[PDB]
């Protein structure tokens, strides 16, 4: 309604929301969002910034003893730090059709790195976890975000080490939110500021006042030993994201800042070889492609990400035809490349013994 | 404007202009339908640049074969035909000029006229169409590739385009524009698929496990997009999956062998024939070859491990051929296939 | 007999037949030279007489290149005018020595992130037979030998 | 009332640059219609170009996205305008709008 | 068969056929040099490994020119004795390599304001068979190339 | 592999392209420094072995602004020489890290009141090949730094 | 080297700001802006592992 | 050790010579045809044959040739002699056919 | 010549590499490609035999 | 040279330590981080042997 050329004023405004940019945590958060035009309803659509939520969703919502919960998800989302933000808007949980057709979309994005539905309904939670259970052992590298009900895996996702379980529901001023909202947001913080190779394990909670279930030690101890993550509370500090480990117990996959690591190096030497498809299968090309590899993985080396003392002791790139190939494999139109790499593992128990004699 | 006194004069109209920056071995037909209401009534046209073509057609249109010619100069792009469909294999036989079949928003004619100039030998190269539907994913996918030909010639190319001015390009052109970039800097021995065609998006986004249904027997041969890379052809396969005929790479680069071996050899046809005329046609294939393997078109290092002429009086031809005219070569080359599979195989140990 | 696959293993390599990858194309080129591997060099004295020699931290490298001036698209110019105050694509260069086919490497030559920091007119001159010559010169910060 | 003309500033900006262009191409008036011709002329219209665009003319980031010259034969032309005596010669220019409104939106919530 | 109208595509130039022109006229020289496209260079280093290399800002090119000494009139002394304190006609160099009738350019290297800083007598020598050659530099602000 | 988006996100920023706001007006100048932020040094000891250590009070910046003599009109001075006994018309000056194009602003500095205290007329010498360059001195209050 | 191995450090006790020193700007110069402050603090202590 | 190794080969330079006939000059209008370095590059090749002509015995091919001059004959009152024209070509390389 | 004697001979004791240049690489040149060290060290010592 | 003749000494009474200065790091530097400590005395004698 702006036509006299000076200056307006307003009164009765809402403070805008900060967006970082990131490029390991891209997230795809599957809740009952509202559309206020009917197009984007069953697909997936890009939020750039909350300015861009209000203009497409509905961010009001009024309630009516039920209560909208997914455009507060979000705000906590960019408090925590933003992203990209892909959202599915999925309205009731039991229509199997638009869950049947979910994973097929995810693939025609290219970019999601993160899934973590926040919604505060625990059958809601089950079917789009169950849905998505298939297509992260396809090694698509996508991170699995859940959230435990009482204390435990939610059992469509076992042990994948794809999988993070975040126990405490988080409660806002009070409505109680599950975490994963808030944990996606801290992972697109942690690997701006500390890269993919730091555990995302001391980050204390923007916005949010106070968990649900005041969690103490003794029963820790006995989800520690799972992948569950406990959202603890620090007196000095507040809320803190505690624990790093996934649904995996093996040795190789235990804890999350290991597995993101190697997630987001497939993801960054997938990106750089597709220039290199349909060149001829030569050595000429065989060597290309290992350069391209080497340069990426020196680069990661001399920032931190790899636990090596001489660059060759974090990683190897290996291609030729004696080794890693036979002729019958160049004729049929492939090249196979052995990529090693070596992380560090993040100190999490400190024994302090102390004593008084001298 | 009209030009009435010596100065300079100012014109603020719309105006459009694209350079040529063409190849010689890519001169396609753009093939339209008959039932088409805003063509010009000749059945063959030719048009050299964008220029030419803006004065036949002065307004942007929406139909298939505007589209297709808009995308096409706007790349480079030469000398190009728009035939009606019921006379494509007439111009074909006629203007000898002809290396692409480009079926412009046509299937079902286009087809059975296509079939016929390939058993009639006239060394083209199809550029067919998808359907305009969406693909479902539950498709029983022979039942999807059961109109095209089983012809090494021809590749299908399925997503179409939806062009900036909001109008649907055939993804034959989106496909026949890669060839145009690929030929001049890259040469007819490299694949098509990885160059980036500007100004065109797909209508639809595939995965990869989509793909991986129709990679095999009939070849869809995707146009997806990429960030990086971005909108490029993705595959380079042929109707045909042979172990000689697959790889619309090593069917070109034999088709441009073919026509530049015989447009060399014409200039020696009615000479005698005589063995001093023997060894002048297998030295003027030899000399094309020896400079064709040494800019990396064959595959081999060495001339003896490339190419191959042989011709003789009780070699390829007898004295019973002699006496009618023929003059028997066997000319054998190899060909450099396309590394279509990159395999990582990551792993903590060192 | 030398047998001349053993000429492929133990003969040395010569210098006239090499592939240069600039990012993710080739483009041919002349002459290429400057691909040094230099460190500085840490002394200390005591009195007592122990001399202690260490390398320092090595420096950038400087790579010349330079080729022919053809008609049509100059890649060189192109890379060259995209410098605004900062921002310059860098790119991977790779120099191998090649066999004749020029199909495979014998050795080759890395170079992490260049730059173009100069580039050269040729030298027009009316009484002189030659080809217009460009010569750029990159910088990078690290040369990589891989052989294979 | 349109979108390109609707401010005085863009309109004329387009009628000075026309007008400083116009007066440096009649020194090539009655030149020989030739491909040298063309590129002298591309030049001078370049580098007046290229000095808007550096003191803030022009609204770009790179100096390709604010202007461009086009002259050729196949390119801008046909062989039979320039057996007639003519070249045409295709600009374009990029101009910056100017803000006009300023929204404050004040509040006391923090 | 290599059939020439290919030569003049793919071909590399010679460069000794050039037409300059030096404002609005062709001025017939001999030699042309120093039209270069010059960058300096920004570094900077932390104590934990990051070396930074940056483009600096591109400093200014030097031209030099040389033509013979003609009985007519001296374009080359008119144009840098018109030197008040500050005040110079400005001029825009292009130096095209040409085919040989001399009427289409192949490449050309533009200069924008060109002014000139010097001008050298020729060496008179009575026991040398020469021609008197001037020799002018300029100095201006910016070259570009324009490839056609 | 940089691709120079990366760059203005990663890399630091040159000294050499700056605009300064002054006041309403935007006014060229070729050094600017002292935009300092100082604080002075309260310290406390008793006999006990305390050692108290605190910030005092923020002093003044002094900042030095550099341009050139242009036959216009000198904007600089009539700033200068409307004083009357205390009365300045005290002006804001923004110095902001600047895009290669000017259409960003990187870093900026922010100056609150700022009236000039000295304006030093260039040293005249018939041996020297120089600009005329006056060099004004301002007193403000507070330096502030805004990061877009 | 790589960063994995600590020779001899310097810690400080309770350091705050006394000063911050911006850049000078110059249109002659090649140089990156380099800010510079300064530091009080009580005692310097050295480990050394 | 001593190293031995073939290099690059060499550009092969060609000279063919013949007579001065009453027509017209096909070497001649071959070398003026010149744009500065525009030239109808031609493939040669000499050919050992039978006395008759039918027959083919060992031949020598050229791939790219282009004259670099072509010296007139020298015109001598004093002399019985054909004008013998001498070209000189410039060439890439030189292979052996038998047959 | 046989290579199995020492005539004379210059030992250096403790050298370590500070430069390694690549070799110009010319295509019109027919020679080999030679890389060249510099090394340093702090005794040079000659002994006869 | 060898270390097994005093030429000249001097000699330090009763020498403790007023300061310690810890190198000027630097990374543009090729230098030894060198302490440099300094001392209070209260006479300096000379023997010669």
């Given at each position: 309604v702006t036509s006299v050329p000076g200056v307006y004023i307003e009164e009765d405004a809402s403070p805008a929301m900060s967006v970082s940019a990131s490029a390991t945590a891209v997230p795809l958060f599957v809740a009952r969002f509202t559309p206020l035009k009917p197009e984007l309803a069953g697909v997936i659509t890009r939020i750039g910034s909350w300015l861009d939520y209000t203009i497409l969703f509905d961010s009001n919502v009024p309630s009516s003893v039920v209560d909208p919960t997914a455009s507060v998800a979000l705000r906590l989302y960019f408090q925590n730090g933003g992203g990209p933000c892909y959202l599915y808007p999925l309205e009731k949980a039991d229509d199997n059709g638009p869950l049947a057709a979910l994973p097929d979309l995810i693939d025609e994005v290219g970019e999601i790195t993160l899934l973590a539905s926040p919604d505060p309904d625990e059958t809601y939670r089950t079917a789009v976890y169950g849905a998505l259970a298939a297509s992260?052992?396809?090694?698509?590298?996508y991170f699995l975000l859940a959230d435990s009900v009482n204390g435990d895996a939610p059992s469509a996702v076992g042990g994948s080490a794809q999988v993070a379980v975040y126990y405490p529901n988080v409660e806002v001023p009070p409505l109680s939110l599950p975490p994963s909202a808030l944990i996606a947001g801290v992972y697109g913080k942690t690997d701006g500021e500390?890269?993919?190779?730091?555990?995302?394990?001391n980050v204390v909670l923007n916005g949010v006042s106070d968990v649900s279930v005041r969690v103490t030690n003794e029963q820790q101890a006995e989800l520690n030993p799972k992948g569950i993550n406990v959202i603890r509370h620090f007196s000095d500090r507040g809320l803190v994201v505690w624990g790093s480990r996934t649904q995996k117990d093996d040795d190789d996959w235990r804890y999350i800042p290991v597995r993101r690591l190697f997630d987001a190096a497939e993801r960054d030497i997938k990106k750089a070889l597709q220039p290199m498809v349909f060149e001829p299968n030569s050595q000429l090309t065989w060597k290309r492609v290992q350069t391209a590899i080497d340069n990426y993985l020196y680069r990661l080396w001399q920032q931190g990400a790899?636990?090596?003392?001489?660059a060759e002791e974090a990683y190897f790139v290996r291609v030729g035809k004696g080794i890693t190939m036979t002729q019958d494999e160049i004729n049929q139109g492939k090249m196979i490349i052995q990529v090693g790499m070596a992380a560090v593992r993040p100190a999490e128990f400190i024994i302090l013994k102390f004593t008084q004699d001298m | 404007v009209t030009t009435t006194y010596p100065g300079v004069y100012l014109s603020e109209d719309a105006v459009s202009s694209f350079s040529v920056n063409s190849a010689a071995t890519a001169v396609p037909l753009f093939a339209y339908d008959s039932e088409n209401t805003n063509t010009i009534n000749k059945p063959i046209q030719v048009f050299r640049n964008w220029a030419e073509f803006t004065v036949e057609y002065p307004t942007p249109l929406e139909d298939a074969f505007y589209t297709s010619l808009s995308l096409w100069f706007m790349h480079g792009g030469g000398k190009c035909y728009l035939v009606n469909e019921a006379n494509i294999a007439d111009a074909v036989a006629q203007y000898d000029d002809i290396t692409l079949i480009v079926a412009a928003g046509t299937d079902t004619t286009t087809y059975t006229a296509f079939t016929t100039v390939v058993g009639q030998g006239y060394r083209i190269f199809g550029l067919f169409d998808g359907p305009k539907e969406k693909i479902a994913g539950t498709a029983k996918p022979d039942e999807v590739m059961e109109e095209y030909p089983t012809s090494p010639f021809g590749a299908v190319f399925y997503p179409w385009g939806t062009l900036a001015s909001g109008a649907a390009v055939p993804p034959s052109a989106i496909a026949a524009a890669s060839i145009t970039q690929t030929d001049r800097t890259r040469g007819v021995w490299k694949a098509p698929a990885n160059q980036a065609v500007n100004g065109v998006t797909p209508a639809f986004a595939v995965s990869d496990d989509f793909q991986g249904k129709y990679n095999?027997?009939?070849?869809?041969n995707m146009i997806r997009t990429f960030s990086?890379?971005?909108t490029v052809v993705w595959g380079a396969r042929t109707l045909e999956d042979s172990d000689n005929w697959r790889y619309i790479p090593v069917r070109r680069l034999f088709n441009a062998v073919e026509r530049d071996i015989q447009k060399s050899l014409n200039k020696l046809v009615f000479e005698p024939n005589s063995q001093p005329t023997w060894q002048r046609v297998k030295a003027a294939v030899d000399s094309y070859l020896h400079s064709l393997w040494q800019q990396g078109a064959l595959a081999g290092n060495t001339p003896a491990d490339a190419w191959f002429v042989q011709v003789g009086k009780d070699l390829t031809m007898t004295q019973e051929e002699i006496n009618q005219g023929k003059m028997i070569i066997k000319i054998g080359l190899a060909a450099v296939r396309p590394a279509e599979f990159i395999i990582l195989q990551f792993s903590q140990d060192i | 007999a030398i047998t001349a696959d053993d000429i492929a293993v133990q003969y040395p390599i010569p210098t006239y037949r090499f592939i240069v990858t600039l990012g993710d194309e080739q483009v041919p080129f002349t002459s290429a030279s400057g691909l040094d591997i230099n460190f500085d060099t840490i002394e200390y004295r005591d009195g007592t007489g122990n001399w202690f020699k260490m390398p320092g931290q090595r420096q950038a490298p400087n790579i010349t290149l330079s080729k022919g001036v053809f008609p049509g698209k100059n890649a060189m110019y192109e890379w060259i005018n995209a410098?605004?105050?900062?921002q310059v694509e860098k790119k991977d260069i790779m120099i191998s020595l090649t066999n004749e086919a020029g199909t495979e490497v014998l050795v080759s030559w890395n170079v992490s992130n260049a730059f173009p920091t100069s580039l050269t007119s040729p030298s027009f001159d009316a009484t002189s037979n030659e080809i217009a010559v460009q010569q750029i010169t990159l910088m990078a910060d690290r040369v990589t030998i891989q052989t294979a």
């Open positions: 992260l052992d396809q090694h698509k590298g500390r890269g993919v190779w730091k555990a995302p394990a790899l636990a090596g003392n001489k | 095999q027997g009939k070849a869809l990086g890379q971005g | 410098i605004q105050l900062n």
